Point group: C3
Chain length 110, copies 3
Amino acid sequence: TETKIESNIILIYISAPNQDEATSIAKTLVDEELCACVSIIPSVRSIYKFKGQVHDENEVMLLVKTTSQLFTTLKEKVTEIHSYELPEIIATKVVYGNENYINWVNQTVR
Amino acid sequence: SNIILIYISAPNQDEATSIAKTLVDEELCACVSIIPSVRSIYKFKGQVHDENEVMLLVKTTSQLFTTLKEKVTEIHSYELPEIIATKVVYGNENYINWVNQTVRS
Amino acid sequence: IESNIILIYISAPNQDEATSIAKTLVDEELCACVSIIPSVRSIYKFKGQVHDENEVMLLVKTTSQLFTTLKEKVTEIHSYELPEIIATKVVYGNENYINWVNQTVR
Ligand SMILES: [Cl-]
Ligand SMILES: [Cl-]
Ligand SMILES: [Cl-]
């Protein structure tokens, strides 16, 4: 059985400097119903150039599941509370999903 | 590119591995990357939870999404599993050809 | 309206090669940043048998315009004969960060 509804689901990558902040950010977004769930990937290394030098720092990655309709409200909350001056908040589109899960995300969020 | 990347969550390493090997063996995907030690945060009956999970990243073709979804729903211990796919917009040609030659049609 | 930023998954056999690949791409300005996930298991079929090997995953952030050049660099330096270089679309992001990626790449 083919899914018979469209997907309005997005998957947002948000980075954080440590597990403590990743978790407090994820619990806030869930509690305030700005997302349905978050998966936190530990122990990630971040490589980037700053003032001409290559850096290698540790980070934690959040994968946040929500609806396209909530992106802007979620983005504003994250930028309000994030310890970084310029955090990484980037959405990808869920093109296919199991129909029951698409419905669950839509019923769970605001 | 007709390639998709599917995120599937599992409650432990044993089930993550048996799911991944079934999908690979039955040619419903070309490969799976298993990320260990992931934390799942979600609200249940009004309370916020923080539980362990293991994440599968499955690489396959858009044409196989539905067949793979049905197989996963058949064998997954969860009543409502998470089977969500994103589109691969670009890839190296040799890899795209390999995925297409590996999977069932 | 959707953004021009992509996120590229690239697999590598160990942490040393993941890191040298990422530093080369960052230093040569083919990407703005890379996130490296350690300790991944790779499951695949080869000659009829299912294998389970260690791998390391790079998530590379860059612009759609750079995909082909970045791809050619990765295929030049990667130890695998057939690496995995697959892009997904960033449909939107925080504006300051989308601007930063676009200003950081060459
Ligand atoms: Cl900062
Ligand atoms: Cl359940
Ligand atoms: Cl090879």
